[PDB]
Design a protein around this ligand. Structure first.
Ligand SMILES: O=P(O)(O)O[C@H]1OC[C@@H](O)[C@H](O)[C@H]1O
Ligand SMILES: O=P(O)(O)O[C@H]1OC[C@@H](O)[C@H](O)[C@H]1O
Ligand SMILES: [Mg+2]
Length: 448
């Protein structure tokens, strides 16, 4: 077999049988052989074992003659930003944010923070590590500590006109991940009043592993919004490359609707741009992008595909319904910080609440939410769905699984690239009844 920690998009496994300091050192050696010239940026998340894994990575890299730029405890987006900003040969973020307590991982990028994925270097690294029985060399390169966040913070603040911001009251919930450290560095330069929930970084995660999608975790942010009369709330995953929004009523806003909203926010600053979106939920994004004079570009889901498509299109912005938002000048990469700054500015300038910014769009294009299925035979289940609907002759697109457009309703059905599951999304043209009957019909077919 092969080392199971090497997945399609990153490295992820239980410590210490699937990921440990010796593997991390070997990964550093192998990474050095996979990159063009230059130093390598390293950072890590709040998990207790993360520093030691980073240090082993550094030892392997420096044994291979790579200078290391240690950016410290950070978010994943800071590894992306510093790798590109400093013109480094690549970067590694030590994190496996959503996984259980005994798990860690690594996200790897090359020049300009371009992803290293299974077919673009990661499995080459895996195979080198797998066969590497050499004794560890000693370091022949240096490590520098570079914890200055000025250029990163200035980049974040460039997405808003400070003089137009109003003193909104914002709930922020880092979930004991790392997001609060950036919020607090930004706060002196913003007029907002922050209500800080689960704010201190704690790798023991006393309030649960950060995952705002779990209803119990979602409810902590919703309660804080309602109880404090906040204008909106923001929660993050642990490495804070994903952001999650709650309007003033406490209602969680499905990520689908933020894609169109953020696209309009960016198109106001960069008119006529191309906007990359995924195939799971589309109609609202296409309409809002075109209404704002942008050009929507359909792309397979998954951060590496989004980024490569954005690059080829000079796209100003990309958005996935899975809470990932990508910005051209941010190394074409995803940020959990840029989106809430943009939303705070929209609310400030428009005088409209976040609820009003999305309400009509949610009524116009209601969606199922992503529904996941572990079935005995994914291929037979997909075929059962398609055969059932054949007599209606949907328009079919195979960008990412199967997308079927029936006119007043559509669905996307695909296999996950990170887990052995099928993922379903359905939306309709303003018809909540059709949404529910079709969702339940597909569900029954998949479970058959
Ligand atoms: O654990 P994370 O690396 O923070 O999240 C990743 O794995 C979980 C997915 O929901 C995310 O979209 C993906 O980015
Ligand atoms: O498991 P997957 O569905 O293949 O990928 C997920 O993890 C990475 C994100 O880019 C995707 O949008 C998210 O859906
Ligand atoms: Mg994350």
């Amino acid at each position: 077999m092969t080392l199971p920690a090497f997945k399609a998009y990153d490295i992820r496994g239980r410590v210490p049988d699937e990921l440990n300091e010796d593997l991390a050192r070997r990964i550093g050696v192998a990474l050095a052989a996979q990159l063009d010239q230059g130093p390598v940026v390293l950072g890590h998340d709040v998990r207790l074992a993360s520093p030691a894994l980073q240090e082993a990575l550094s030892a392997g890299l420096r044994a291979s003659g790579r200078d290391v730029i240690d950016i410290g405890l950070c978010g994943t987006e800071e590894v992306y930003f510093q790798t590109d900003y400093l013109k480094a040969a690549g970067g590694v973020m030590v994190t496996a944010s959503h996984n259980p307590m005994d798990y860690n991982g690594m996200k790897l990028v090359r020049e300009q923070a371009r992803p290293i994925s299974s077919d673009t270097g990661l499995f080459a690294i895996r195979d080198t590590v797998a066969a590497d029985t050499a004794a560890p060399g000693e370091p022949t390169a240096s490590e520098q500590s570079r914890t200055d966040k000025t250029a990163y913070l200035e980049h974040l603040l460039s997405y808003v006109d400070r003089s137009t911001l109003k003193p909104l009251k914002l709930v922020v919930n880092a979930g004991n991940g790392g997001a609060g450290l950036i919020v607090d560095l930004l706060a002196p330069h913003l007029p907002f009043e922050f209500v800080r929930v689960f704010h201190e970084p704690d790798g023991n995660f006393p309030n649960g592993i950060p995952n705002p999608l779990l209803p119990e975790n979602r409810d902590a942010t919703a309660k804080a919004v309602k109880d404090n009369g906040a204008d909106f709330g923001i929660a993050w995953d642990g490495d804070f490359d994903r952001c999650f929004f709650f309007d003033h009523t406490g209602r969680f806003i499905e990520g689908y609707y933020l894609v169109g909203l953020l696209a309009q926010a960016i198109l106001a600053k960069q008119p006529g741009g191309k906007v990359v979106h995924d195939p799971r939920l589309t109609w609202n994004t296409v309409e809002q992008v075109e209404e704002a004079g942008g050009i929507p570009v359909l792309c397979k889901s998954g951060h590496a595909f989004i980024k490569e498509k954005m690059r080829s299109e000079n796209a100003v912005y990309g958005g996935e319904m899975s809470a990932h938002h990508y910005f051209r000048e941010f190394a074409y990469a995803d940020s959990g910080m840029i989106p809430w700054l943009l939303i705070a500015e929209l609310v400030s300038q428009s005088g409209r609440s976040l609820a009003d910014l999305v309400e009509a769009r949610m009524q116009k294009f209601p969606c199922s939410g992503e529904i996941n299925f572990k079935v005995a035979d994914a291929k037979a289940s997909v075929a059962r769905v398609m055969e059932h609907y054949a007599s209606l002759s949907p328009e079919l697109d195979y960008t990412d699984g199967i997308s079927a457009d029936f006119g007043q309703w559509r669905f996307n059905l695909r296999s996950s690239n990170t887990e052995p599951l099928l993922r379903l999304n359905v939306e309709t043209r303003g018809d909540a009844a059709l949404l529910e009957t079709r969702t339940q019909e597909i569900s029954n077919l998949l479970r058959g």
